[PDB]
């Protein structure tokens, strides 16, 4: 069991 | 005072390992799903692929067995359990989803073991394809939207 | 001959109860922290969550009071008091730790009451997130490694 | 001889500690479980011996005020059956009036784990109030 993290991103600007 | 027991276990024998990750303190950092920049209302489906934090390409799981091993992949629902990115300052949310195939059809259903195969001496990539629905309604507030999906390579 | 007294007490009135446990004989069996299979030397932090023995998900503590009750959670150091899993046959040990938050930051310090809140008519889950450091040094011997952490839901 | 630490002299009777199960409702489904807290320091009873060679001392606990290990409500006559075990997994029971063996080395504190355990009460709701008992622990040689 290898659980990790996946950072999700979105820059709502222009 | 209700005291109970929690049995801890680990089978050190011939397991499978996940490459492409970096150890962020005590939690594996698998990668980033960077949709990029966008305006308030986007008509096109915003779409980006996971970038492994260690090498910049896809997560490359390899197994240590000689025979083909069938390992599973499960992704959770994010910080709020409904796959929504949240603005760092305001309370605006941006609904998204992660799919397994390049055509956004085979969805990584929340807390589900999407099956996978791996041969001896190879790197089977784990495609985590992100996808966001068109936002032709309200313009979400300016700023940075984030989420931390926990990917669970389990056997 | 030194005989003394041990006062026994129990306040039956409006207490708090812990769900997700099974009564193993005369000791509550709260769950299992299953890291899974692994090889001698693992480069990725091995990480798994507690699975309640009664329902397979997280331990779901509920209180019987109408007002919010603030209950605490304390986990001990395991069989050898230093959080090490021991091989069933050999004397090899595998150091580990249990954290409270999904990002492996808020550690359940040994014999410490990590605070918790619970509202009337709800199941507040007790996340016991396990984490093991990368073993890029010596390959620990083959077999099964175990430990029995005693979780202490106390008020 | 050998001496028992962690106790306080309550008048003329050693006060070894408290087995505090905590608060609970009428009917509890989970086994209520708590450890003895020494009255002097708040942790376990720490027996030490004064000999240079290892001494083998015994520990015996009796059946409580009513000799059947039942806590009694201070006001009503309701009873709550319980038991004290020696190991953390509630298996090695401190049988009534029995010398459960123990070892102690020179210059160390061998703790006496008195692990309490109460069976699930999924039948009748016992009346509200405080239930008590006074187990007499007998460190004898």
UniProtKB/TrEMBL annotation, chains B, C:
Domain Spore coat protein U/FanG span(s) in chain numbering: 3-152
Disulfide linkage: 16-63
SMART domains: SCPU
InterPro entries, per the entry: Spore_coat_component, Spore_coat_U/FanG
Pfam family, one: SCPU
Protein name: Spore coat protein U/FanG domain-containing protein
